[PDB]
Each structure stands twice: as structure tokens, then as C-alpha cells.
Design a protein around this ligand. Structure first.
Ligand SMILES: Nc1ncnc2c1ncn2[C@@H]1O[C@H](COP(=O)(O)OP(=O)(O)OP(=O)(O)O)[C@@H](O)[C@H]1O
Ligand SMILES: Nc1ncnc2c1ncn2[C@@H]1O[C@H](COP(=O)(O)OP(=O)(O)OP(=O)(O)O)[C@@H](O)[C@H]1O
Ligand SMILES: [Mg+2]
Ligand SMILES: [Mg+2]
Lengths: 572, 569
């Protein structure tokens, strides 16, 4: 609740910080000791060196070493910074591993392109910190405890002033440190908004060439930056406010010396007291910059509490192959506004089931449900009269292939877009058979050499027709028990998909297959068919069995029949 | 060529840096003066102050006021940092405006998700810099010139040592500054690779749940970070190397005082000489961190030389409406491997032309050409017997609508996905007619209130079916002379698109329309049709005119006829 205890708990999860820093902090302490001891000895030494040269050859060597050991402080600056580079790299490690094992039901709410900078830019603020953080704080805290003990009159008999220098200053940093905390949470919640704007803009540059967007999306960037980030000077204004305020209470201690305070002691008293400031200007800098870190990490804390959606809790059950039964499952994408209404159907093995619905139904959502992404409230999904959750959470995903309604590809270099299914044993003499079972090898070999070809970002390299045929090979290399085709009519011609339908029939005969498609002439011979509508389903059986029996549509097909009856009489 | 002259030229383009910094640098100079003058006066003052409380009270209250002007240094630290915040914001301004006016023929080569961080993270390295950069450099350079003049014996009669302290140190920083420059260009060319990895991964999280990717794409991140960025400690190792090496030449000057002065003031000479180090430790820090900036900006320079693809060179010609003629245009996406082979066809006005080709042809690469993105080598594109380049470069884009083969949407809040065509005069009582002409208003009004609805990143809140119908409204709000539909069969059903075809026929009758589509039953009544194949075209005329006459395919249609003959029997 104190916003401080989790932060040291946060760096605690990066384990190996304790080892080398403990050595690294130690020699920086004695670095403060030798810098304490240096200016008093040389002024007596030179008087000592009036003798000069003799003491000098030997002491020249001595000083070189000594002065070489004055350069040993650089090794402390190195070794702190090395463990400084360790602690940031542990954050980026632990942030990234949590980031992909968390449920997909998070990412739909908040902006994948926003949270990505919270890996980078909400760590790099601790790199610049941890030099000024540690090294400045330790070098002062020994000097201030080194001051008042040698200011021995003022901590045993004149204590009533050295109990004013810290606590009255401590009241001053409290609104500053709180305001410093309310700023660093804002900028770091706006760097993420700023980078999130651009990654939702820059890959879509072909649309932003709409010739009126370029005068506008530039204007959104400037309104992104200058109204916020030059308005990030609000940090720097308060940052410079600390200057007078440390002194404005410190000189208040200085005027206090006449209210309570022989004369031979007063002159030495001023001499030691003015050695406090360059120490005191460091410790307050640390307490400022510390609260800068917290607001830059307070957002990063909450994304370490979301609940680890991939479990490997496989109880006794992964392997056998049984039919799939949906049992009154009703899904809500938002729990007060649901779109699926206790649908109940059975997916028998070895036979291609299909799903056909109009635009706006629950077609694709039932597929994302059948990857067990949500497993909603009312209803259970079972297989073999066994509930699908208790098998495992996502080792059951391994048995299934899946292609989306769109065709997604990462920064591919084509052969790696197909590869990571079996992920270790790709068997290069088999990918071409997965290409031949997808009509891919025909229009790949004329390109420069399948490996050597590189797709774009979202896969621009290849085009749109080649995109869909590439992604369908991903499911046909994983060799699944259960296929899941979402759009086999998406971006491909009738010449292609006839080879596709004639290919997977050799594959899938004891391996059941759920495929939805537009344009019902691709699922006419399916062994089952469904007609889903707005979260409800009103159909069963074969298409010929459904056309004569059911009287709901009776022209969904005839909407597509009359679009094809024109082609006969126009040709003959 | 010197890698330095463009950098000061780079900040020169951010104009207003000259104004306030000149005031800001000035009072920091006299801040160095008062810090020079302070420790000598007080030690003589306290002996005169011991003339009691009286000596202190009334002069000392001004000394508090004097100590308030010691806090005036903070205002210099502020005003430097304020102009420090100005110069970074000018970079992000000038980088962003150049970034979107440059040709699309750049972005296909290098990785939009890579170059985006070069807006942010290759500017923020100058923010931390410019405090340590300027303020540290100015506060030393006056002190070192303030030292040797008060070390007056050693710059007129013992000069032969103060001509060693700088130039022999200057040899030492040369490999360091060069190595420091070869490091900062690497990390900043790897922050961009690291962020570019994630934005090509994180929005595709539904695919990365392939259950074997999570154990792998996590491993690519760690191999991204730890093999490179904990290996970014190579900076910090050389960064700490400067410590001995400034002194290891400085004490070499110290041993030199007996080689020329030992046979011949010496006690006061040591006292002023040891005041040089905390100055000298600042100036070398500046020359280190300066070369850190250059490698973090050398990549940023070259993206200010690419050539401004939107010109507003409209010569005399924007407005009239004439047919479109392609004349032997041959496009290469790579100039030694071209895919379009001097295609020649004519697009007559008022009549829907279509294009149908198999997978792998040049069907869209002719649409992206028809937005004048490339305008390739062999051949000219003309309209009205007038070449299309000399009209304007992209004010001609305003007359045209266009939807892609995919359906793209930005972070929308639906009404803003349709809005920025006319971009100032959206006329809220008309968007619904642009929705009614796209079969959008039917399945929008049941959602929570068209404005209030928000799509996802790539429209993931909306459907796939709803995505395509939304994007097609964008062209039907701009009210074009020329439509360009790329996939009216993409993600939409036969119930939808029959309304779509029956809608735009009321719109397009004197407004010509180029539409490609799968599944030839949507272009059967087109007034012209083309059959493009691998960059070549082998068809003309009407479909019924092409089916009997041409003998190339003769079963491209029959490939789709026999798939529909099963539905009757
Ligand atoms: N936030 C959301 N997440 C997931 N699905 C949503 C969300 N909001 C709405 N939906 C619904 O998801 C449904 C299913 O989309 P689907 O996968 O069926 O697209 P499709 O298969 O192309 O079919 P359609 O043609 O009906 O869009 C849509 O009806 C849409 O209303
Ligand atoms: N970024 C790119 N720019 C231009 N051409 C590309 C690019 N990436 C790949 N290509 C090549 O351009 C060819 C043309 O594809 P096109 O633009 O016609 O897409 P398409 O209309 O979907 O093609 P099809 O419908 O024939 O599959 C592809 O075969 C591909 O080899
Ligand atoms: Mg889908
Ligand atoms: Mg296309």
C-alpha cells in the first residue's frame, strides 16, 4: 500500500543482484573514505615535501599507485553499472515471459501496441537512475554521518540544531516527491499512448495515403507530442524547484546558530558545517529520482498479477481421439451482453462438419471458443463424455490446427512461417508435401528459392492470394487430428481450391474437420451442416436433408442459385 | 564526411534553440564566476565577522539573499533543460513529418515496426545528454581557462608543460571516442530490432497461441535481449575506462615538473594545479557523450534525405473527367525482376470494367500502380490523352476511392474510420447514407450507438464480416469519380452483396468503376473484362463475347459452373 515495498520486491525477483553489488558497494564505501582523507594530508605533506625530490621519486611512484588507486573508483562505477545493466535485463526478461502466457481476454481490452513500449521505455528509466540512485546515495550518507561526528560539539552539547537539518527538510520533499510521483506515472502512461498511436498508423501507410489523412495523422502526432511531451516539462519545473528548498531550510538552520549559541569553537564550526551541502545535494536527488522510478513502474506491477493462462496441468488425459460435444455453451464477450445462446451440437469423428451463417452471427467466435480461449459461464464443452478443461489447458491445442478468418504472418522468411509446429524436427523433406497438400509448391518454386524469399511485415512480400495458401500449410504441417479452416474461400481462386479439396480428403478420413466458408457450394457434400444465427442455431443434418425439411431460410441457397443460373443461358 | 557538421546542422533545423539558450548559457557563465570567487572571500570574511553577531546580522541577512542567488543556478538548470526539451521535440516533429510524406517504395524494404522506435528512442538519448552535454562543458571550459592564467608562471615562462596536458590527452580519447561511436550506432540499431520484433509478434497473439510458439517466441525475446542488451555492457566497460586514462596522462604532466622545473613558487604551483581535475573530468565526459549521440543519430540522418513523394505540383490539370488509358506499362517491384509486361488496355467512363486472374497474377499490383505509387519504367499511364503524372502527384488521389485486398482499420471508434475523406465537413446527416449504400446501418444500430463503439487494434472488436463492410463505406463517403473495389467477395455473404450491387448502380452511372473479384458470378454483366496472367493479359470484351471467341481458358468459368450444377439435382 506504501508504493515502496513492492518496488524492492520487484527487483528481488531478479535474483543475482545481491552477489556482485555487495562487492561493488563495498569498495565504493572505502572510496568515500579516501576522498574524505585526501585534502588534509597533502597540505601537511608538501610542507613535508619541502625536501621535495627525494621523497618524490619514491612518492611519485606512491602517488601514481595511489593515484592509480584513485582510478579504482572507475571499476566501482563499472561494476555498479554492470549490475545496473543486470537489473534492467532481468525486468525485460521477467516482463516478457509473463506477457505471452497471460490470457487473450486481456489483450482485447487494452491495446497491444500500447503495452509493447512498457517493455522498453518503462525499463530504461531505471538504467539512468541506478547510477545516480545508488552511487550518489551511498557517497553522501557516509559523509553526513562523517560530518556531525567531527562536528562533535553540535551532536552532544549543541544537538538542538542537527535535529533540525533533516526533519524540517523532510517536510519539504513530501509534496515534491508526491508531485514527482504523479508526473512519472503520466508520461510513462503517455509514451505508451504515443508509440501506440504510431504502430496503429505506420504499417497501414497504404490507407493513410487517402490524401487527406496525411494532413491529419501528422496533426495527431503533433497533438500527441507537443501537447503532452513538451508539456512533460512539468517534471523539469519541479525538478529544478528542489534547489532553493534544500538551502532555504538549510540556511534556516544557519540562522538558528545565533538563537542558541566559545568564539574559538564558532570559527571551526562554520568550517565543517559548509561541507554538508554537496553531500546534501546528492541525497535529495536520490529521493527525487526514486519516486520518478515508481510511477514509471507502478503500471508495470499490475501486469505481473494477471493469471498465467497456459498451465501444464494435464491430469491423466491428452491422447485419445473422441468426438466433440458442445453442451449448452453460452458465451459473453462482455458478461452483461452475451453473443452465444446455449448452443448444443455434436461433432462426430471422421466426417467434415460445416458451419454456415450470415454476417454477424457467431461463426468465428465459436472457433475461438473451440481453441479454449474463454470457456464461458453457462455450459460445458466435452469430448468423449469428458470435459475439455480437465485434459490440459493448452496441450490440447497441440492436437489441433487452426487458421484465422484473416491470414496472419509474422516477419517470416517463408519457411519459418510454417516451421514452429513440431518446432524441433521440421524434416525438410516433408514441408514440400505440406506445400503440395496446400497448392503452395506450384507458385513458390518460380520465386527465388523458398527459404531465400522474405515476406514483409504483415506479410506484404507475398500478396494476398499467396498469403492464404501459405497460412493453410501451417495447419497441414502440424498433422492434426482436428483441422479448423476458417476461410477456404478468402483469397484464392477456383483453380486453387479444387486441388485443396482433393488434397485433404486423402489426409482427413479418420481425422474430423470443422470448416466454415462463404458461398455454400464448397460444403454441399458435408456430412453435417449447421445454420447459426445471432448466437442461436436453427439447423442440422445434410444440406439436401436440410433444404427440404427446414423452412427457415429456403432461399439462402436460392440466393446463391439464381446468381449462377445466369451463366448457362449467357453462354448457351 | 566528418560526422560532426551534419549534427549541428541537424539541430539547426529546429529553429528556436538560439533564443532562450543564449540567455540561458549566459547566466550559467556568471554562475561559474561566483563559484570561482566564493571560497577565497569567506575565509577572510569570518575573521572580520568574528567582530560578532553585529558583523553577521545585517550583512548576513543579505548573505541569505546572496545565497538565494546561489539558487538562481537552478533557473539556469531549468532554462537549459527547457530548451533541452525543445530540441528533442523539434526532432520528433521534423522526423514525423518527413516520415509519412516519403514514398511507399521505401517501406516495403525496411520494416515499419523497426523504424517506429527511431522516433522515440533515438531522440530520448539526447534529453539525458543535453544537461551533461552543455552545462558540464561550459562549466569546465571557463575553469580551465581560469586556471592557467592564475597559474601565470606556467603559461608564460613554464609553458612547456601546459602544452602537454591537452594534446597528449587528446590522443587518448581518439580510439575511445571512435569506439564509443561504433557502439551507440549498434544499440540504437538493435533497440529498433528489438521493438520491431515485438510489434511483429504481440498483435498476432491469437496465432502465437499455437502452443509451441510460446516456448519459442519467448526464447527469441531472450535471445533478442540478453545476447544483445546485456551485451550492451560493452558501452559501459569503455565508459569506465576513461577514469584512469585522463589521470594517467595528467600525472605524466605531474612527473614532468621535475624534468624542467626541479633545478629552478613550487608550493603554490601544486595548489593551483590540483584544482584542474574536477574541471577536466567534465570536459572529457562531454566528448564521450557527444560521440554517443552521433551513432544514435547517424541512422536518423539518412531518413531525412528520402525524396518527399507527395508534391503539390498541380500544373494546370486536376478536374475534368476522362477515360483511363494504360499504355504498355511494365512494372518491376525489383528492377531486375519485373512482374508486369507492357500491359495495354483502356478504361472507358461510366461502365464497370473488371479484372479476373488466377492466384499469382498482377491483379492488384495493377491497382497499387493505379494509385500512382510507383509509375514504372517502360510505359506511361495517361487519361484523356494526357499523362497522369503531370496532373499532380497525389491530389489526383483525392478523386479516387480505394479499398485493399484486405480490410484495414486503424484504432477507429467506427465513425472516425469513415471520416477523414472530406476531413473537415463530414455532414453527420450523410454518413448513414454512406452506411445505407454499404449495407452497414442494418448491423450497426443494434450495437451500442455507432460513435460509442470502438474497434480493436486492427478492428478486432468488430467482426471479419463487419470489417469489410465498414471499409467499403470509406470509398462510398468520399463520393469519388472512380471507385476501386478489390474484394467484394472477401468477408460478406450473398445476402449482403446483393444489396451492395443494387446500391452502387444508383451511384455509379457516369462514374466509372474498376472492380476485381473472385468467383466470376459477380462480374458477369460487366461492360468489359480482362484476364490477366503472370504480368500478361490475354482477354478483352464482354464475358459472353470472351467465352465463345477466346480459346485460352474455355473452362475457367466451367471450373465454377460445375461447382454449382450439383445444387439443382
Ligand atoms: N470484442 C469481440 N470479440 C470477439 N467477437 C466479437 C466482439 N465484438 C463482437 N464480436 C462478434 O463476433 C462475431 C463473429 O465474427 P465471425 O468470426 O463470425 O466473423 P465471420 O466468421 O466472418 O462471420 P460474419 O460474416 O458473421 O462476420 C460477430 O458477430 C461480432 O458481433
Ligand atoms: N510488396 C510487394 N509489392 C509488389 N509485389 C509483390 C510484393 N510482395 C510480393 N509481390 C509479388 O507480387 C505478385 C502480385 O500479387 P498481387 O499484387 O496481384 O496480389 P493478388 O491480386 O492477391 O494476386 P492473386 O490474386 O493473383 O493471388 C505476387 O505474386 C508476389 O510475388
Ligand atoms: Mg473467422
Ligand atoms: Mg488485392
Amino acid at each position: 500500500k506504501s508504493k515502496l515495498k513492492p518496488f524492492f520486491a520487484l527487483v528481488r525477483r531478479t535474483n543475482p543482484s545481491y552477489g556482485k553489488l555487495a562487492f561493488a558497494l563495498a569498495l565504493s564505501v572505502v572510496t568515500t573514505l579516501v576522498s574524505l582523507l585526501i585534502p588534509l594530508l597533502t597540505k601537511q605533506l608538501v610542507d613535508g615535501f619541502s625536501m621535495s625530490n627525494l621523497s618524490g621519486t619514491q612518492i611519485g611512484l606512491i602517488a601514481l599507485v595511489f593515484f592509480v588507486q584513485a582510478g579504482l573508483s572507475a571499476y566501482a562505477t563499472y561494476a555498479l553499472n554492470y549490475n545496473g545493466q543486470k537489473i534492467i535485463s532481468g525486468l525485460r526478461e521477467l516482463l516478457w515471459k509473463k506477457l505471452i502466457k497471460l490470457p487473450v481476454s486481456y489483450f482485447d481490452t487494452n491495446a497491444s501496441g500500447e503495452t509493447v513500449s512498457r517493455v522498453t521505455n518503462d525499463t530504461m528509466v531505471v538504467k539512468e537512475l541506478i547510477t545516480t540512485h545508488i552511487s550518489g546515495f551511498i557517497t553522501g550518507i557516509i559523509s553526513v554521518i562523517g560530518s556531525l561526528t567531527i562536528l562533535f560539539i553540535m551532536n552532544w552539547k549543541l544537538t538542538l540544531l542537527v535535529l533540525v537539518v533533516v526533519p524540517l527538510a523532510a517536510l519539504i520533499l513530501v509534496p515534491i516527491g508526491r508531485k514527482m510521483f504523479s508526473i512519472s506515472r503520466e508520461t510513462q502512461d503517455e509514451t505508451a499512448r504515443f508509440t501506440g498511436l504510431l504502430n496503429q498508423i505506420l504499417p497501414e501507410i497504404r490507407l493513410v495515403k487517402a490524401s487527406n489523412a496525411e494532413d491529419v495523422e501528422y496533426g495527431r502526432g503533433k497533438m500527441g507530442i507537443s501537447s503532452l511531451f513538451k508539456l512533460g516539462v512539468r517534471e523539469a519545473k519541479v525538478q529544478s524547484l528542489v534547489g532553493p528548498l534544500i538551502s532555504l531550510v538549510l540556511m534556516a538552520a544557519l540562522v538558528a546558530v545565533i538563537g542558541y549559541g566559545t568564539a574559538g569553537a564558532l570559527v571551526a564550526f562554520i568550517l565543517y558545517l559548509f561541507q554538508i551541502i554537496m553531500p546534501m545535494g546528492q541525497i535529495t536527488t536520490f529521493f527525487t529520482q526514486l519516486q520518478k522510478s515508481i510511477g514509471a513502474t507502478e503500471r508495470m506491477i499490475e501486469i505481473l498479477a494477471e493469471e498465467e493462462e497456459d498451465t501444464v496441468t494435464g491430469k491423466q488425459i491428452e491422447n485419445a481421439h473422441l468426438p466433440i460435444q458442445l453442451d449448452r455453451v453460452s458465451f459473453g464477450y462482455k458478461p452483461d451482453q452475451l453473443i452465444l445462446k446455449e448452443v448444443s451440437a455434436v461433432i462426430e469423428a471422421g466426417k467434415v462438419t460445416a458451419i454456415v451463417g450470415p454476417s454477424g452471427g457467431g461463426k468465428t467466435t465459436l472457433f475461438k471458443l473451440l481453441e479454449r480461449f474463454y470457456s464461458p459461464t453457462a455450459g460445458t464443452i466435452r469430448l468423449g463424455d469428458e470435459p475439455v478443461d480437465t485434459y490440459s489447458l493448452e496441450s490440447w491445442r497441440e492436437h489441433i490446427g487452426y487458421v484465422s478468418q484473416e491470414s496472419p504472418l509474422m516477419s517470416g522468411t517463408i519457411r519459418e512461417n510454417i516451421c514452429y509446429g513440431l518446432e524441433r524436427d521440421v524434416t525438410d523433406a516433408e514441408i514440400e508435401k505440406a506445400a503440395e497438400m496446400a497448392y503452395a509448391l506450384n507458385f513458390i518454386k518460380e520465386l527465388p528459392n523458398q527459404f531465400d524469399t522474405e515476406v514483409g511485415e504483415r506479410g506484404i512480400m507475398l500478396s494476398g492470394g499467396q498469403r492464404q495458401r501459405i497460412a493453410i500449410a501451417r495447419a497441414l504441417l502440424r498433422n492434426p487430428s482436428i483441422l479448423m479452416l476458417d476461410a477456404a474461400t478468402s483469397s484464392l481462386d477456383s483453380q486453387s481450391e479444387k486441388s485443396v479439396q482433393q488434397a485433404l480428403e486423402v489426409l482427413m478420413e479418420g481425422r474430423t474437420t470443422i470448416v466454415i466458408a462463404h458461398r455454400l457450394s464448397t460444403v454441399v457434400d458435408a456430412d453435417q451442416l449447421l445454420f447459426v444465427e445471432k448466437g442461436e442455431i436453427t439447423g442440422r443434418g445434410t444440406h439436401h436433408e436440410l433444404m427440404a425439411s427446414h423452412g427457415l431460410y429456403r432461399d439462402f441457397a436460392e440466393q446463391q442459385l439464381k446468381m449462377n443460373a445466369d451463366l448457362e443461358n449467357k453462354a448457351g
